[PDB]
Amino acid sequence: EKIIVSACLLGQPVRYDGQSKGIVSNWLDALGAEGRALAFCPEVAGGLPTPRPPAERQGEHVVTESGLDVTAEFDRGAELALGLCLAQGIRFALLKEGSPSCGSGRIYNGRFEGVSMAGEGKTTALLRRHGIQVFSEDQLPELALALSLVAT
């Protein structure tokens, strides 16, 4: 029935630079109009401000370029995303690609050099570990299908 969605994909200005990543989708707009797309930002939920410095995963740690360790906030935001899914009975997530929290197919490599690698963010990894299917904004058709199959 409902899905959890990265708040930036819904146009909320919660990105590290205060920007949004609002996607153009008639389907996502309709889902939101029905009260079925729950906005959530793991980094803001975890206690990080907006704006905030860029961060990259370095294995299980998440750090900024200056070496500040923000894993505590990233892990809290991931656990709150899981908590919202369990409370609302959500089995699907639409999360922002490339993010150290929301990435699902790729993330930055931890070297702060603009290089991506195959991998997932901290929130995606925890949701997948608990049986929640995570799709990126590049997989809207697949997500829409997965949600429609259980409708009747």
- Binding-site residue positions: 41, 43, 102
Whole-number Cα distances in Å, 13 to 10, 18, 39, 112: 9, 5, 12, 23
Residue 110, contacted partner among ligand SF4, Cl ion, none, CB below 5-8 A by kind? none
The residue from 7, 28, 82, 127 that contacts ligand SF4 (CB under 6 A) is 7
Rounded (10°) angle between helices 26-33 and 140-149: 40
Q: Report the 10 Å Cβ neighbour count for 115.
A: 10
Nearer to Cl ion, 36 or 52 (CB): 52
6 is an interface residue for ligand SF4 by CB under 6 A = yes
Quick one: which segment of 26-34, 39-47, 58-66, 104-112 binds ligand SF4 (CB under 6 A)? 39-47
- Judged by CB under 5 A, how many residues of this single chain contact Cl ion? 1
Give every CB contact of residue 121 below 8 A, 6+ residues apart in sequence.
57, 95, 99, 100, 101, 102, 103, 104, 107
The residue from 42, 92, 124, 136 that contacts ligand SF4 (CB under 6 A) is 42
Residue 99, contacted partner among ligand SF4, Cl ion, none, CB below 5-8 A by kind? ligand SF4
104 is an interface residue for ligand SF4 by CB under 6 A = no
Query: What span, in angstroms and rounded, lies between the C-alpha atoms of 45 and 140?
Result: 24
Interface residues toward Cl ion, by CB under 5 A: 98
